[PDB]
Amino acid sequence: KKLEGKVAVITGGAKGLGQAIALAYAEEGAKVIAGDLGDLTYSHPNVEGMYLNVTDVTGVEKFYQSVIDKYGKIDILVNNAGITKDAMTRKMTEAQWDAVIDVNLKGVFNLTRLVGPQMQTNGYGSIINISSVVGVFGNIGQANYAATKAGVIGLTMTWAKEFALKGANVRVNAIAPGYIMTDILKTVPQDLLDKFAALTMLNRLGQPEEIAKVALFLASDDASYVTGQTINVNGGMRL
Amino acid sequence: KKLEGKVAVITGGAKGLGQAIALAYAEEGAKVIAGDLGDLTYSHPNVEGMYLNVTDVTGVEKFYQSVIDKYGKIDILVNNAGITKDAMTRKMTEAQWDAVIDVNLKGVFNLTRLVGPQMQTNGYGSIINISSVVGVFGNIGQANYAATKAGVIGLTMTWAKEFALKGANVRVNAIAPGYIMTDILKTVPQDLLDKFAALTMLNRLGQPEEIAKVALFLASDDASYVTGQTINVNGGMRL
Amino acid sequence: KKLEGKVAVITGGAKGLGQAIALAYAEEGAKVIAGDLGDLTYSHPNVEGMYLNVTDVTGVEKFYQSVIDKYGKIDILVNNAGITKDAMTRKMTEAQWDAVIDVNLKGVFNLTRLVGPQMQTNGYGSIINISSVVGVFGNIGQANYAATKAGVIGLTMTWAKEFALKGANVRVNAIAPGYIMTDILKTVPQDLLDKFAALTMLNRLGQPEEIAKVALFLASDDASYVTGQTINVNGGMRL
Amino acid sequence: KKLEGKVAVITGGAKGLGQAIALAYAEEGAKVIAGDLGDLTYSHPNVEGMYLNVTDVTGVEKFYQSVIDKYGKIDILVNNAGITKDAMTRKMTEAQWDAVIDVNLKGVFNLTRLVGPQMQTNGYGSIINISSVVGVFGNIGQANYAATKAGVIGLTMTWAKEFALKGANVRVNAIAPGYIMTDILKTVPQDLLDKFAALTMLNRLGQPEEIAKVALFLASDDASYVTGQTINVNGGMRL
Ligand SMILES: NC(=O)c1ccc[n+]([C@@H]2O[C@H](COP(=O)([O-])OP(=O)(O)OC[C@H]3O[C@@H](n4cnc5c(N)ncnc54)[C@H](O)[C@@H]3O)[C@@H](O)[C@H]2O)c1
Ligand SMILES: NC(=O)c1ccc[n+]([C@@H]2O[C@H](COP(=O)([O-])OP(=O)(O)OC[C@H]3O[C@@H](n4cnc5c(N)ncnc54)[C@H](O)[C@@H]3O)[C@@H](O)[C@H]2O)c1
Numbered sequence: 041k042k043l044e045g046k047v048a049v050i051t052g053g054a055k056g057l058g059q060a061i062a063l064a065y066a067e068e069g070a071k072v073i074a075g076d077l078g079d080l081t082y083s084h085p086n087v088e089g090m091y092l093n094v095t096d097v098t099g100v101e102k103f104y105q106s107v108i109d110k111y112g113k114i115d116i117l118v119n120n121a122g123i124t125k126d127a128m129t130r131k132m133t134e135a136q137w138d139a140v141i142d143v144n145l146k147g148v149f150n151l152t153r154l155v156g157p158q159m160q161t162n163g164y165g166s167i168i169n170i171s172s173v174v175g176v177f178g179n180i181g182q183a184n185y186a187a188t189k190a191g192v193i194g195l196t197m198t199w200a201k202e203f204a205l206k207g208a209n210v211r212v213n214a215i216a217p218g219y220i221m222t223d224i225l226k227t228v229p230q231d232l233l234d235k236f237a238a239l240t241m242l243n244r245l246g247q248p249e250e251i252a253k254v255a256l257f258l259a260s261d262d263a264s265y266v267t268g269q270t271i272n273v274n275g276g277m278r279l
Numbered sequence: 280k281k282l283e284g285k286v287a288v289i290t291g292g293a294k295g296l297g298q299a300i301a302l303a304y305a306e307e308g309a310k311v312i313a314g315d316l317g318d319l320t321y322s323h324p325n326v327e328g329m330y331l332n333v334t335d336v337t338g339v340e341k342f343y344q345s346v347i348d349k350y351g352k353i354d355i356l357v358n359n360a361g362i363t364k365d366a367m368t369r370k371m372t373e374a375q376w377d378a379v380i381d382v383n384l385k386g387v388f389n390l391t392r393l394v395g396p397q398m399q400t401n402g403y404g405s406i407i408n409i410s411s412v413v414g415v416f417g418n419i420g421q422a423n424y425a426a427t428k429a430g431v432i433g434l435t436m437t438w439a440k441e442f443a444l445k446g447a448n449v450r451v452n453a454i455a456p457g458y459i460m461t462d463i464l465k466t467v468p469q470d471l472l473d474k475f476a477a478l479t480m481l482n483r484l485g486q487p488e489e490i491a492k493v494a495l496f497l498a499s500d501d502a503s504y505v506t507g508q509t510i511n512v513n514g515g516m517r518l
Numbered sequence: 519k520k521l522e523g524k525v526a527v528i529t530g531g532a533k534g535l536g537q538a539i540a541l542a543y544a545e546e547g548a549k550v551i552a553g554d555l556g557d558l559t560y561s562h563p564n565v566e567g568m569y570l571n572v573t574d575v576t577g578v579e580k581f582y583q584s585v586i587d588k589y590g591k592i593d594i595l596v597n598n599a600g601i602t603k604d605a606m607t608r609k610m611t612e613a614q615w616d617a618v619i620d621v622n623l624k625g626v627f628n629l630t631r632l633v634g635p636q637m638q639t640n641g642y643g644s645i646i647n648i649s650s651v652v653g654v655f656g657n658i659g660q661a662n663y664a665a666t667k668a669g670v671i672g673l674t675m676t677w678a679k680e681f682a683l684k685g686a687n688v689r690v691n692a693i694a695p696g697y698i699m700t701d702i703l704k705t706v707p708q709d710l711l712d713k714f715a716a717l718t719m720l721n722r723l724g725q726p727e728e729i730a731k732v733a734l735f736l737a738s739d740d741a742s743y744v745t746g747q748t749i750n751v752n753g754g755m756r757l
Numbered sequence: 758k759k760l761e762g763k764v765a766v767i768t769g770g771a772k773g774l775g776q777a778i779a780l781a782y783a784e785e786g787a788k789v790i791a792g793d794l795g796d797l798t799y800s801h802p803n804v805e806g807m808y809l810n811v812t813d814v815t816g817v818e819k820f821y822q823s824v825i826d827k828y829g830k831i832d833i834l835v836n837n838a839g840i841t842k843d844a845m846t847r848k849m850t851e852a853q854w855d856a857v858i859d860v861n862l863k864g865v866f867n868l869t870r871l872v873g874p875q876m877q878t879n880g881y882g883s884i885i886n887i888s889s890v891v892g893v894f895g896n897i898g899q900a901n902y903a904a905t906k907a908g909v910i911g912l913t914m915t916w917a918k919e920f921a922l923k924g925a926n927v928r929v930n931a932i933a934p935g936y937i938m939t940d941i942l943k944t945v946p947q948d949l950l951d952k953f954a955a956l957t958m959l960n961r962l963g964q965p966e967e968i969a970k971v972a973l974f975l976a977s978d979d980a981s982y983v984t985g986q987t988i989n990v991n992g993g994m995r996l
């Protein structure tokens with residue numbers, strides 16, 4: 041199978057895109073660890089749920105070491121955990137700003153600074169960061185979120201360079217999804233979601249499996265000459 | 280299999296990337312028509328060679344109608360045929376300019392103007408154009424080639440919009456390869472090749488199969504929410 | 519003045535953006551040669567109209583040599599002449615394709631292959647190519663035009679590299695205008711002007727002077743460290 | 758003069774690019790406030806130095822209100838304050854991460870959330886964010902910096918949309934400088950400076966004034982139809 045014998049960590053893996061990615065990987069033979077604040081909303085023999093708060097530095101170290109102790113190595117990392125706290129910038133509170141940067145940007149750093157160097161030392165890995173169409177185009181009411189999702193692209197390019205030093209076969213890429221119905225959209229008015237669908241060339245929102253399949257491509261050796269990239273998976277949207 | 284029952288046309292399919300893409304498709308259940316000026320340099324039970332000169336408008340129509348007569352429809356098109364005629368712009372001749380625009384840009388139009396609308400009418404298809412790192416960054420000695428490979432991106436985006444009108448599930452994307460070991464690199468001095476490898480994050484040139492696997496991804500329903508995109512497959516190169 | 523003592527050639531300089539750019543340059547101390555098929559629709563003490571058909575290679579050389587004989591050198595070149603021949607790809611004729619590629623792509627090459635190397639030899643120059651928002655995003659009914667305006671970006675990057683080799687202070691950039699109210703856009707129904715305007719962040723179309731001021735910036739030493747770039751001047755449009 | 762009558766705030770205005778921008782604006786008639794942690798290293802009659810720590814939310818409000826009380830309005834904002842704390846990601850400390858995100862991303866938010874809405878309410882303004890070639894390409898040893906300078910592009914696009922709502926003529930853009938000879942770069946070994954220069958098409962590093970001239974263009978009405986953009990001012994660099 042495509043990921044047979046590979047160990048994959050998925051942050052925010054309890055539901056939504058993270059669930060879809062975990063299941064796609066597990067169906068292709070990966071040993072998957074789905075880390076989340078919440079219990080998994082699903083079961084698969086090759087998905088282990090673990091508690092993970094990507095904002096708790098001490099907790100991230102404990103999670104990382106627990107995975108290494110049990111599974112030996114981490115071949116694939118998907119930095120998928122993410123939140124929104126939307127507001128017009130005129131009204132956005134310090135807490136709305138801080139929380140989004142902490143999960144979506146620092147939380148990516150907190151775990152990658154452990155996993156990525158481990159991949160370099162092992163001479164192999166694939167890291168997939170989850171950006172957003174909002175990071176590529178900006179979006180009203182989302183200065184915090186857009187900063188993080190554009191920021192993830194900066195991390196992606198930097199780490200694609202760094203972790204491939206000294207001949208290490210480590211790739212780092214990002215996926216920038218368009219709009220997919222998950223709980224992250226709970227505060228987004230339906231008028232906007234309908235507008236977003238109409239802005240795609242395919243005239244529709246995406247499904248979680250449509251992101252998972254691209255994540256599977258990038259994690260696998262099929263994408264062996266793809267690194268440093270941000271792949272837009274957005275039905276052709278311009279936002 | 281990923282392309283079971285699909286009919287795929289690959290221009291420039293006799294060797295190089297076109298051959299690699301044809302074989303990848305053929306191994307995933309597609310019936311492949313490999314169109315080229317030259318005889319195929321390989322065989323496969325699912326690949327049929329046909330004469331195709333993408334610059335001969337009348338011949339392209341004949342080729343197209345022959346494929347439709349045999350198989351009834353075309354589900355996948357890869358516009359891969361391409362040439363170089365390198366020269367500094369200071370010295371480039373009219374013939375060097377004209378030939379490259381004719382194959383690499385008009386040739387893409389000549390066949391796609393038949394296949395793409397047929398996909399739109401059938402309600403389904405996937406078109407993969409082959410750009411180049413040179414279209415994304417430019418390159419010394421290649422203004423003609425760069426114009427065409429950047430031009431192909433304009434075609435890609437336009438057609439991703441046009442052929443998905445009226446609810447048609449037609450996707451159009453481009454692959455921009457970096458430097459891949461094929462015959463098109465015969466004329467490039469070896470010192471420059473070594474330089475090219477060092478410009479990649481992976482510190483190596485690519486193999487044809489590394490492009491073929493991405494072409495397979497895009498042709499398949501795995502890429503169902505990917506359209507209008509140019510995927511760089513270049514080992515992280517900046518040129 | 520910003521361009522005092524410089525000699526500038528503007529193709530398509532009889533009206534529209536070409537006229538606005540010519541006048542902006544002429545008001546900043548440049549001697550401007552406005553080349554066009556038609557007579558200039560304006561006059562200025564620093565603008566000389568000359569016949570130029572960018573598609574006639576022999577005539578382009580005659581124009582070039584005439585300008586050099588009179589003016590000694592050309593410091594600035596704006597490759598502005600351009601046309602559309604719109605059609606859905608399914609109906610686009612060979613002539614509609616050919617004419618647009620010949621003016622908008624080959625025409626740029628035809629004059630630049632003389633002027634650019636001359637700037638390099640002289641140790642100084644600035645070239646401004648005119649792309650379009652359509653080259654950046656594609657547009658239904660404009661595959662030919664989109665191919666050319668995306669292709670111009672490939673030319674831009676290539677020439678920025680080539681003409682600055684061996685110590686020459688030659689810069690090459692492009693402007694990608696959004697929808698600008700030239701004679702041609704003045705005819706379109708208001709209902710549709712409103713539509714394009716609504717795709718911009720400023721909720722309006724542009725004026726020709728708004729392109730000219732950017733062309734003045736890039737031609738001038740204010741842009742001395744800007745090369746290889748395509749500047750979108752489009753009110754924040756996503757098309 | 759180009760900015761006569763306009764009030765401009767420049768963060769990090771005591772030295773480096775901020776100084777160059779402040780002086781360029783002052784020479785074109787702007788009333789300039791240069792905010793910084795330290796005293797200005799220069800004098801000009803139309804530059805007022807003020808204490809500003811962009812990371813102190815409360816102090817930022819006090820600074821903002823002081824400027825409004827004295828000058829009435831803020832027409833132009835340049836978010837230039839920035840720091841580096843370089844480290845390979847494997848060694849980067851939490852403090853190195855935190856400080857760079859706080860200045861380079863949150864600091865931009867802290868002041869813009871006051872100034873930008875004020876521009877929207879006044880119906881006019883121009884905001885210039887300072888990104889970097891590192892935000893566009895990534896760079897080894899600079900994951901924190903790259904995250905922030907890519908993030909600034911996300912902010913730029915978001916605010917170009919938000920602050921122009923309801924017909925307000927507010928533009929938001931970014932400049933991404935290449936390697937510019939400010940104080941730190943002068944101390945790097947000559948071998949390295951030559952290496953960096955060799956990555957540019959012009960084979961040289963930039964001077965601060967070359968950034969300031971672009972900042973002047975964007976602040977001015979010459980850039981009236983430019984918004985949502987990131988302008989690379991890098992000599993044609995690929996990093
Ligand atoms: N659904 C979309 O339209 C869309 C579009 C673009 C990008 N994204 C991104 O996709 C990713 C996944 O989001 P989703 O749409 O599945 O949303 P979701 O809310 O359904 O799932 C997010 C998951 O991440 C978790 N999480 C939140 N904070 C965490 C923390 N501190 N530590 C560990 N886990 C944490 C949640 O508990 C949750 O299970 C996010 O990065 C999001 O920004 C989503
Ligand atoms: N190999 C690389 O490094 C690289 C990088 C980027 C892009 N590309 C491109 O990928 C494509 C394939 O190139 P390749 O590397 O396999 O080169 P190649 O020279 O090995 O193969 C090209 C094939 O196209 C065919 N062809 C040429 N003109 C034709 C015409 N008028 N009609 C029909 N067929 C024609 C050739 O006969 C040949 O079989 C090209 O578009 C090329 O520009 C290659």
Ligand SMILES: NC(=O)c1ccc[n+]([C@@H]2O[C@H](COP(=O)([O-])OP(=O)(O)OC[C@H]3O[C@@H](n4cnc5c(N)ncnc54)[C@H](O)[C@@H]3O)[C@@H](O)[C@H]2O)c1
Nearest residue numbers: 530532534535555570571572598599600650695697698700
């Ligand atoms: N106006 C817009 O909204 C817009 C947007 C994006 C790009 N553009 C581009 O800006 C440029 C200027 O367009 P415009 O709106 O001013 O159009 P225009 O039609 O008003 O003017 C074009 C001028 O180019 C000249 N020209 C055409 N073919 C020529 C040839 N073979 N040789 C010499 N001159 C020739 C014409 O005679 C004419 O004077 C074009 O490249 C156009 O594609 C325009």
Ligand SMILES: NC(=O)c1ccc[n+]([C@@H]2O[C@H](COP(=O)([O-])OP(=O)(O)OC[C@H]3O[C@@H](n4cnc5c(N)ncnc54)[C@H](O)[C@@H]3O)[C@@H](O)[C@H]2O)c1
Nearest residue numbers: 769771773774794809810811837838839889934936937939
């Ligand atoms: N010089 C370059 O090559 C280059 C390239 C790309 C981007 N940049 C960026 O340009 C900007 C200016 O850089 P520079 O080269 O002039 O650097 P610099 O270090 O010479 O000057 C930066 C100034 O911002 C200041 N500053 C730092 N923290 C602050 C805070 N909390 N509040 C207020 N002011 C603060 C400093 O006191 C200093 O005066 C930075 O954002 C930067 O990262 C510089």
